[PDB]
Design an enzyme around this catalytic site. Structure first.
Site, mmCIF file in Angstrom:
data_model
loop_
_atom_site.group_PDB
_atom_site.id
_atom_site.type_symbol
_atom_site.label_atom_id
_atom_site.label_comp_id
_atom_site.label_asym_id
_atom_site.label_seq_id
_atom_site.Cartn_x
_atom_site.Cartn_y
_atom_site.Cartn_z
ATOM 1 N N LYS B 111 0.797 -1.223 0.000
ATOM 2 C CA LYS B 111 0.000 0.000 0.000
ATOM 3 C C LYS B 111 0.833 1.279 0.000
ATOM 4 C CE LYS B 111 -4.466 -1.642 1.796
ATOM 5 N NZ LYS B 111 -5.629 -1.186 2.623
ATOM 6 N N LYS B 192 -5.201 -9.515 -5.552
ATOM 7 C CA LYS B 192 -6.467 -9.856 -4.929
ATOM 8 C C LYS B 192 -7.493 -8.755 -5.163
ATOM 9 C CE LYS B 192 -6.594 -7.875 -0.273
ATOM 10 N NZ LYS B 192 -7.905 -7.176 -0.445
ATOM 11 N N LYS B 195 -11.811 -3.707 -2.265
ATOM 12 C CA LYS B 195 -12.907 -2.742 -2.394
ATOM 13 C C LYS B 195 -12.458 -1.308 -2.671
ATOM 14 C CE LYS B 195 -14.055 -3.086 2.120
ATOM 15 N NZ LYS B 195 -13.032 -2.634 3.096
HETATM 16 N N1 LIG Z 1 -9.865 -10.766 -2.277
HETATM 17 C C1 LIG Z 1 -10.245 -11.220 -1.092
HETATM 18 N N2 LIG Z 1 -10.617 -12.555 -0.952
HETATM 19 C C2 LIG Z 1 -11.045 -13.133 0.261
HETATM 20 N N3 LIG Z 1 -11.103 -12.348 1.405
HETATM 21 C C3 LIG Z 1 -10.747 -11.025 1.313
HETATM 22 C C4 LIG Z 1 -10.319 -10.415 0.108
HETATM 23 N N4 LIG Z 1 -10.028 -9.088 0.306
HETATM 24 C C5 LIG Z 1 -10.283 -8.902 1.630
HETATM 25 N N5 LIG Z 1 -10.714 -10.062 2.260
HETATM 26 C C6 LIG Z 1 -11.075 -10.216 3.721
HETATM 27 O O1 LIG Z 1 -12.021 -9.244 3.973
HETATM 28 C C7 LIG Z 1 -11.944 -8.746 5.320
HETATM 29 C C8 LIG Z 1 -12.036 -7.281 5.378
HETATM 30 O O2 LIG Z 1 -10.854 -6.672 4.744
HETATM 31 P P1 LIG Z 1 -10.853 -5.210 4.205
HETATM 32 O O3 LIG Z 1 -11.903 -4.433 4.896
HETATM 33 O O4 LIG Z 1 -9.477 -4.701 4.273
HETATM 34 O O5 LIG Z 1 -11.219 -5.348 2.638
HETATM 35 P P2 LIG Z 1 -10.504 -4.823 1.289
HETATM 36 O O6 LIG Z 1 -11.347 -5.200 0.156
HETATM 37 O O7 LIG Z 1 -9.190 -5.492 1.125
HETATM 38 O O8 LIG Z 1 -10.489 -3.244 1.426
HETATM 39 P P3 LIG Z 1 -9.416 -2.112 1.065
HETATM 40 O O9 LIG Z 1 -9.140 -2.206 -0.381
HETATM 41 O O10 LIG Z 1 -9.947 -0.791 1.447
HETATM 42 O O11 LIG Z 1 -8.182 -2.380 1.843
HETATM 43 C C9 LIG Z 1 -10.718 -9.460 5.937
HETATM 44 O O12 LIG Z 1 -11.120 -10.653 6.608
HETATM 45 C C10 LIG Z 1 -9.955 -9.739 4.654
HETATM 46 O O13 LIG Z 1 -8.886 -10.651 4.693
HETATM 47 MG MG LIG Z 2 -7.409 -4.441 2.815
#
Ligand SMILES: Nc1ncnc2c1ncn2[C@@H]1O[C@H](COP(=O)(O)OP(=O)(O)OP(=O)(O)O)[C@@H](O)[C@H]1O
Ligand SMILES: [Mg+2]
Ligand SMILES: Nc1ncnc2c1ncn2[C@@H]1O[C@H](COP(=O)(O)OP(=O)(O)OP(=O)(O)O)[C@@H](O)[C@H]1O
Ligand SMILES: NC(=O)[C@@H](N)Cc1c[nH]c2ccccc12
Ligand SMILES: NC(=O)[C@@H](N)Cc1c[nH]c2ccccc12
Ligand SMILES: [Mg+2]
Ligand code: NA
Ligand code: NA
Lengths: 328, 328
Positions: B111, B192, B195
């Site tokens: 990041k 991966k 969001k």
């Molecule tokens: N691609 C993915 N596949 C499966 N689980 C995921 C994935 N991305 C995030 N998670 C799971 O979702 C949960 C919430 O993570 P988080 O809120 O950081 O989501 P994010 O999509 O990665 O958001 P951001 O991009 O803002 O960091 C955690 O348990 C994390 O490991």
């Molecule tokens: Mg994240």
């Protein structure tokens, strides 16, 4: 009237350097301003502190604030950790400060100088200090020349938050004494006196007894000249001692230079020890009174209650500007 | 019974990746454990968030937690910032974590990859996450394969505090699904799904409408082979799509490979979009019900009240072991 804020860490027993550079002025300032004087225990743990020693140092610092003359009806005296808002606003502020800004702090580079593994708290000290100040819409911050850069960063952070999210914080200004803003170590005249110096000979605490003050002043580093004259560059040890003697006695460096013509480091040193002893005497007596009453705890309870009222409301405002939580 | 904790940031609208990797399992787990499911708004501001967008994303995430089936009588649902203890224990923990440990986190390096000036919150994210978990004496942490390293550091921190100050924290264990622990980006099969990806085509949110889901699945990156077979190394785009289809439909990759023999990326893609649409349909309907009632606010009030009760007591215990404040 205007607002004042200033904090001291319970990382040890405060020294004459802390007194001359800051505490002494708190006493005068409390009557002309709305003041918050803090015991910053969350800053203290940025380095190891024995838990029993920390609990005890927190209580002693409060007794010393009051012992020097801080009137709890004219100022708010409280412990940082008893006001959750400090930690809450510290997190918000550390989300707006840049890593490079933190890495460039001289205090950090210094205190992290020569260490293999260092706590993150050492690096993130500044945003917590900025929170301490900004939570109270502080106008004036009495310190402490070594704290100038932290206050400059605090102003940078206040402005950044203000322009990024909307006007909220007052832009604080440092107030550094013209004299005694940087008392030096008795053992290393090129370094400032610090209450956490690994060498107890470096500093004199407000709780040192007479014999101890005599020894420490006696072994203070000087020079082989034997002349009592102010010369910060040539005679750093003697200049620092002259400075302490001067701010504590009310005599000018000029006057002391004359009084000590034809002397005499041994006699100049012995005299100085007595001047420091006579200064701390009434302070120590009042310190003991506070340490043995429940009144000390009531003052702190009252102070935290007032501080929480003001800080928690600023935290609400901060959260609202950033969009955290829910509309309240 | 044992305790569970898990948080999701309101940094955007949660995606099918968030659902498959974590949220989906919360729903099953709530009946067998004592669960705390958090909306981590203090983690969200480690990067810029428009304040109006953050306030709105916080409310939507709560509606989505409940819309997927989290029962507020079986689990505690609350907003991180409404529980001051998270910030308080975060500070204590950042005083025990080493800078190097923080600098080595892959999430941070990632990041912070390619950025000139980065917020300190980005670097100090981990100790706040460790606090989130440790405050509740959590046994199990359901995630989220990308969160494995953070949980390993959380264990390191728990042990360090335990051996440094005395046994207090439970040592948590991660629980990462055997399938769907890492759903990939539709646009970059080597990364991966996130969001907050600057490219909305990379992810499907739980709030995407049918037309939008169709477009995103349609433009998902694949290969020029034209064969629907699982091969993560050779066919990363097609393997990820097969994985999503499989966990959402209940069919094995083997079964889908057979069903799609003699096809047909266009038809495989069109079918997949409908499978995702049919999945989100009932979720979206319940989401709208929650967004328009005051009941949503009451659930969050109740959840914060319960969370504050537990967390503030752990903070008292932490302060006592470290020697902060006064004997309580
Ligand atoms: N691609 C993915 N596949 C499966 N689980 C995921 C994935 N991305 C995030 N998670 C799971 O979702 C949960 C919430 O993570 P988080 O809120 O950081 O989501 P994010 O999509 O990665 O958001 P951001 O991009 O803002 O960091 C955690 O348990 C994390 O490991
Ligand atoms: Mg994240
Ligand atoms: N040598 C000094 N001369 C004048 N003022 C000082 C000196 N050292 C500290 N101060 C002032 O004392 C106040 C409290 O600082 P602080 O609690 O950090 O003391 P310290 O002695 O430097 O402790 P530590 O060694 O643990 O860092 C601040 O206003 C600070 O600038
Ligand atoms: N001397 C020091 O190391 C300062 N960081 C002590 C301090 C902490 N918070 C503050 C707020 C205002 C003024 C001073 C302080
Ligand atoms: N996915 C993420 O980036 C995690 N850091 C989200 C998160 C914050 N606090 C937590 C506590 C437990 C489990 C997960 C979390
Ligand atoms: Mg200091
Ligand atoms: Na006053
Ligand atoms: Na339950």
């Amino acid at each position: 009237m205007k607002t004042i804020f200033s904090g001291i860490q319970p990382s040890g027993v405060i020294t004459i350097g802390n007194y001359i550079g800051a505490l002494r002025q708190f006493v005068e300032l409390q009557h002309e301003y709305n003041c918050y004087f803090c015991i910053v225990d969350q800053h203290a743990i940025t380095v190891w502190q024995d838990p029993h020693e920390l609990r005890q140092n927190i209580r002693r610092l409060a007794a010393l604030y009051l012992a020097v003359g801080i009137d709890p009806t004219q100022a708010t005296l409280f412990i940082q950790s008893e006001v959750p808002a400090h930690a809450q606003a510290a997190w918000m502020l550390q989300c707006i400060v840049y890593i490079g800004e933190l890495e460039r702090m001289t205090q950090f580079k210094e205190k992290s100088a020569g260490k293999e593994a260092v706590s993150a708290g050492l690096l993130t000290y500044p945003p917590l200090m900025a929170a301490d100040i900004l939570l109270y819409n502080t106008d004036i911050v009495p310190v402490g020349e070594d704290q100038k850069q932290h206050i400059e960063l605090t102003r940078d952070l206040a402005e950044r938050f203000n322009k990024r999210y909307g006007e909220l914080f007052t832009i604080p200004e440092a107030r550094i004494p013209k004299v005694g803003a940087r008392i030096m170590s008795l053992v290393d005249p090129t370094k400032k006196m610090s209450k956490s110096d690994p060498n107890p000979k470096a500093y004199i605490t407000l709780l040192d007894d007479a014999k101890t003050i005599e020894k420490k002043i006696k072994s203070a580093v000087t020079d082989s000249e034997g002349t009592i004259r102010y010369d910060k560059e040539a005679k750093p040890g003697i200049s620092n001692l002259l400075n302490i003697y001067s701010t504590l006695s009310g005599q000018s460096i000029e006057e002391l230079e004359r009084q000590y013509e034809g002397k005499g480091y041994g006699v100049f040193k012995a005299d100085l020890a007595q001047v420091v002893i006579e200064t701390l005497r009434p302070i120590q007596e009042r310190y003991h009174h506070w340490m043995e009453s429940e009144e000390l705890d009531r003052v702190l309870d009252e102070g935290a209650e007032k501080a929480n009222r003001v800080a928690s409301e600023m935290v609400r405002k901060m959260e609202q500007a950033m969009g955290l939580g829910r509309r309240r």
